[PDB]
Amino acid sequence: MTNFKLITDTEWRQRLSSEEYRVLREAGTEAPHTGEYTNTTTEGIYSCRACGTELFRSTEKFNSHCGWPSFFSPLAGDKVIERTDTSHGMVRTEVICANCESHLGHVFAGEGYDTPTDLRYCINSVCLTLIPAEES
């Protein structure tokens, strides 16, 4: 749970997937089907491949399986940070990992999903790690 910013480039390469390295570093992209080990059969807790934080949990998850699915409020917002970017006359809320710059995903508000947050998080697209809660 140490500061990931101090990590060297080599450590990052030998820490996570090649796609995760560029994607996490500068939000290079978020294209799935880049890893055969990626498994989402069990529905538990989402975990950043970079560190393994509980970014998202099934409690606010509304989907079975999809390349770019939508979610509701994360575990507690402690594992992820939401910030807006005034790129132009309009701004966008980028989703990042509280432990690393996981600016690979974005979240939209006012989607109308009849939820307390009414957010549409579009992440879990670059081979994110799934934690099997139980599903017994």
Q: Which residues bind Zn ion (CB under 5 A)?
A: 48, 50-51, 53, 97, 99-100
**Beta carbon nearer to Zn ion, 17 or 99:** 99
**Beta carbon nearer to Zn ion, 51 or 95:** 51
Q: Please report how close the Cβ of residue 81 comes to Zn ion at its closest, in angstroms.
A: 10
Per-residue HEC secondary structure of the chain comes to CCCCCCCCHHHHHCCCCHHHHHHHHHCCCCCCCCCCCCCCCCCCEEECCCCCCCCCEHHHECCCCCCCCCECCCCCCCCEEEEEECCCCCCEEEEEECCCCCCCEEEEECCCCCCCCCEEEECCCCCCEEECCCCC
Q: Please report how close the Cβ of residue 90 comes to Zn ion at its closest, in angstroms.
A: 27
Q: Please report how close the Cβ of residue 53 comes to Zn ion at its closest, in angstroms.
A: 5
122 catalytic per annotation: yes
**Beta carbon nearer to Zn ion, 51 or 123:** 51
Catalytic center residues: 122
